[PDB]
């Protein structure tokens, strides 16, 4: 069930919600609903971009990152750098306005520039979180062992 995936993304949203002031201070019920909406639109945004030619950078597949070979070897652990191809952008940011409208149903006083600064970053963190997940699983499935 994809609800399981959206809910898992929602659990993550709740964990990092403290970093975003637009959500960190909401009443419990409202916060839960807002995170549910962000998780639901972010996931749909991820899915669409992955199945749509050109919607994701073809080098990083949405993460906007690449492995720094030298540093990974130096530090004995995976060290990442920006993906040059998309300059770290990874996916289109246009789908976010639909999510903004949905969130305004819950926080009616929220303006777009305020959402942009205090809530949207959480939305984007959830979208890239999905790309990163896919990438890690990819690395795992195709590891020359």
Q: Nearest distance from residue 141's CB to Br ion, in Å?
A: 16
**Binding interface with Br ion (CB under 5 A):** 5, 8-9
Instruction: Say how many C-beta atoms besides its own lie within 10 A of residue 102's C-beta.
Output: 16
Q: SS3 for 9?
A: helix
Q: How far apart are alpha carbons 63 and 75 in whole angstroms? A: 21
Site for Cl ion in 69-98 (CB under 5 A): 96-97
Q: Terminus-to-terminus CA distance in the chain, angstroms?
A: 31
Q: Nearest distance from residue 56's CB to Br ion, in Å?
A: 17
Q: Is residue 83 part of an annotated ligand binding site?
A: yes
Tell me if 39 contacts Cl ion by CB under 5 A.
Answer: no
Q: SS3 for 65?
A: strand
Which of these ranges, 39-47, 51-59, 70-78, 105-113, lies near Zn ion under the rule CB under 5 A?
A: 51-59
């Amino acid at each position: 069930d994809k609800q399981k995936a959206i809910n898992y993304l929602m659990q993550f949203a709740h964990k990092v919600s403290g970093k975003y002031r637009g959500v960190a201070k909401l009443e419990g019920n409202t916060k839960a609903k807002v995170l549910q909406v962000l998780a639901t639109f972010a996931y749909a945004d991820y899915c669409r971009s992955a199945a749509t030619p050109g919607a994701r950078c073809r080098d990083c597949h949405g993460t906007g990152r690449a492995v720094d070979i030298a540093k990974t070897e130096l530090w004995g652990r995976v060290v990442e750098k920006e993906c040059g191809r998309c300059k770290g952008v990874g996916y289109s940011r246009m789908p976010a306005s639909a999510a903004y409208r949905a969130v305004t149903m819950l926080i009616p006083n929220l303006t777009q520039p305020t959402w942009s600064r205090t809530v949207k970053p959480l939305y984007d963190a959830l979208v890239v979180q999905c790309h990163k997940e896919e990438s890690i699983a990819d690395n795992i499935l195709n590891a020359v062992t």
